[PDB]
Amino acid sequence: KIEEGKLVIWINGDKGYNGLAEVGKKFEKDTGIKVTVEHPDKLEEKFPQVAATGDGPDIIFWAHDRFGGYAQSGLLAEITPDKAFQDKLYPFTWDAVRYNGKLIAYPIAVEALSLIYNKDLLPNPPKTWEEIPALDKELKAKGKSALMFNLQEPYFTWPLIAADGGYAFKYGDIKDVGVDNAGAKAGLTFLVDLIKNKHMNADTDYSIAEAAFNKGETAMTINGPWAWSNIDTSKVNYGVTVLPTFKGQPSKPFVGVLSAGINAASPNKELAKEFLENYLLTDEGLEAVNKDKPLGAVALKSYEEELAKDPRIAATMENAQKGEIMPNIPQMSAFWYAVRTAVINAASGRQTVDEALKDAQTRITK
Ligand SMILES: OC[C@H]1O[C@H](O[C@H]2[C@H](O)[C@@H](O)[C@@H](O)O[C@@H]2CO)[C@H](O)[C@@H](O)[C@@H]1O
């Protein structure tokens, strides 16, 4: 079972879980109820497993795209924020955590990918993907490569795939899957070719991209606000700008709204909300986490005004506008799963962009 008398939280390893713990500390100081913050692997898959038998964390943290599935499976408790509190957050954040007319989680921060470049190696970042190949061989004089980002998670390659047309569910329509169209293929082919021509490696994952960039071995990388922290610890003179365009079109990243949901099986649903509404979602609460690992554009209309000034957050939102906020429909896990296989098979060579995307379409629509 879920032990009552405490709060067990779950958040991804790339987020400021220490900053969250800190917030948990002052909760135990003002209430006596201790808080355990953990970051297990594939927590977004783990939760639905355990939470189905009535176990797991009291509150789960993840981008909103997964929450609809959880709510469909009766794993999330409905939240009860009074008008006053709802008004403390931007109306669009709420829409992202609404399912079948009920709010199924609390919005935290808006996440969008941006281009991170080493101002010293690249005082002027490219504006197009097409000019990156040349830039890569040009950078050989300095013994560097052009770009280097995570190729294992479709979240990171999706912007290039959508630039020229590719899409998941048209504006949330299940009856319209575009991971097989011209755009998708065009974009994925450009990526595959970058690997074909030795400008990128199919095995570059999150760890490899970060080390390579923070160690100043690469001129650019792609990531979210949560990555800024470690870049600060490397003294690298970086900048966060717009993502390169493809075929004249802007890269369209899937925007995610970090969210906090309460386990439907939690005996502590009452403590959870006090903690989420009066300890975390407060100016002082978010800074605690944002000081650990940046959260990006937070939903707390107040503490965000003291952050929207940051050129980084500005770029974050700029790319956010060039793309779209993800749907929260249950079908999303199937989408990400399909695309994941496709990009990895196409990248590695086990398949042609055509076969891979077709199969991705099939996996989503069957
Ligand atoms: O790659 C598919 C994956 O994309 C998104 O995951 C992001 C997440 O939103 C960010 O907060 C951060 O953790 O990076 C992740 C990529 O590794 C979706 O939110 C997720 O459901 C999906 O599986």
Q: Whole-angstrom Cα distance, residue 328 to residue 44? A: 13
Q: Whole-angstrom Cα distance, residue 127 to residue 189? A: 19
Question: Nearest Cα to 113, choosing from 74, 157, 75, 163?
Answer: 157
* Residue 145: strand pairing partners: 218
| Cβ-based neighbour number of residue 42 at 10 Å | 9
HSE-CB for 192 with a 13 A CA cutoff: 22
Name the residue with the closest Cα to ligand 1, atom 7: 155
* Residue 99: strand pairing partners: 102
Name the residue with the closest Cα to ligand 1, atom 14: 155
* Residue 128: strand pairing partners: 245
332, 191: one domain? yes
Instruction: Check if the beta carbon of residue 285 is closer than 8 Å to that of residue 87.
Output: no
222, 332: one domain? yes
Q: Whole-angstrom Cα distance, residue 72 to residue 66? A: 10
HSE-CB for 160 with a 13 A CA cutoff: 23
Write the burial class of residue 25 (CB in 10 Å: 0-12 exposed, 13-18 middle, 19+ buried).
middle
Q: What is the resolution of this structure in A?
A: 2.6
Beta-carbon contacts of 316 under 8 Å, excluding residues fewer than 6 positions away, are: 110, 111, 112, 114, 224, 225, 240, 296, 297
285, 310: one domain? yes
CA 243 / ligand 1 centre spacing (Å) = 18
Backbone angles phi, psi at 123, to 5 degrees: -75, -10
Locate the ligand 1 atom nearest the alpha carbon of residue 336 and give its number: 2
Name the residue with the closest Cα to ligand 1, atom 3: 155
What is the CB < 6 Å shell around ligand 1? Answer: 12, 14, 44, 63, 65-66, 111, 153-155, 256, 336
CA 143 / ligand 1 centre spacing (Å) = 32
Range(s) of the domain holding residue 100: 5-111+256-327
Show the beta-strand stretches assigned E in 11-144.
35-38, 59-63, 98-99, 102-103, 106-111, 114-118
Q: Whole-angstrom Cα distance, residue 220 to residue 240? A: 10
289, 358: one domain? no
101, 207: one domain? no
Q: 191's torsion region: left (phi>0), alpha (psi -120 to 50) or beta? A: alpha
221, 312: one domain? no
Long-range contacts for 42-50 (Cβ within 8 Å, ≥24 apart)? 43/10, 43/11, 43/12, 44/12, 46/10, 47/10, 47/75, 48/73, 48/75
- Domains in the chain, number: 2
Do the strands 297-298 and 106-111 form a parallel or antiparallel pair, or are they unpaired?
Answer: antiparallel
| Per-position DSSP letters for 13-29, written without gaps between them | TTS-HHHHHHHHHHHHH
Handedness of CA 294, 300, 301, 303 (dihedral sign): negative
Question: Nearest Cα to 114, choosing from 209, 248, 275, 223?
Answer: 223
Question: Nearest Cα to 251, choosing from 220, 229, 227, 230?
Answer: 220
- CATH code, 125: 3.40.190.10
127, 169: one domain? yes
Question: Chain-centre distance of CA 225, in angstroms?
Answer: 9
CA 31 / ligand 1 centre spacing (Å) = 33
CA 62 / ligand 1 centre spacing (Å) = 8
Q: Whole-angstrom Cα distance, residue 349 to residue 221? A: 23
**What is the experimental method?**
X-ray
> What distance, in Å, lies between the first and last C-alpha atoms of the chain?
36
251, 356: one domain? yes
CA 96 / ligand 1 centre spacing (Å) = 15
Place of tokens 């005996």: 267
40, 96: one domain? yes
Q: Whole-angstrom Cα distance, residue 231 to residue 350? A: 34
CA 297 / ligand 1 centre spacing (Å) = 17
223, 349: one domain? yes
37, 107: one domain? yes
Question: Nearest Cα to 116, choosing from 39, 190, 226?
Answer: 226
Instruction: Check if the beta carbon of residue 163 is closer than 8 Å to that of residue 245.
Output: yes
Instruction: Check if the beta carbon of residue 286 is closer than 8 Å to that of residue 276.
Output: no
Q: Whole-angstrom Cα distance, residue 230 to residue 304? A: 22
Q: Whole-angstrom Cα distance, residue 109 to residue 239? A: 20
The pick from 47, 110, 155 for probing ligand 1's pocket by mutation, whose C-beta has the most ligand atoms within 8 angstroms, reads 155
Locate the ligand 1 atom nearest the alpha carbon of residue 66 and give its number: 21
Angle at 101 between CA 99 and CA 102, to 5 degrees: 70
213, 310: one domain? no
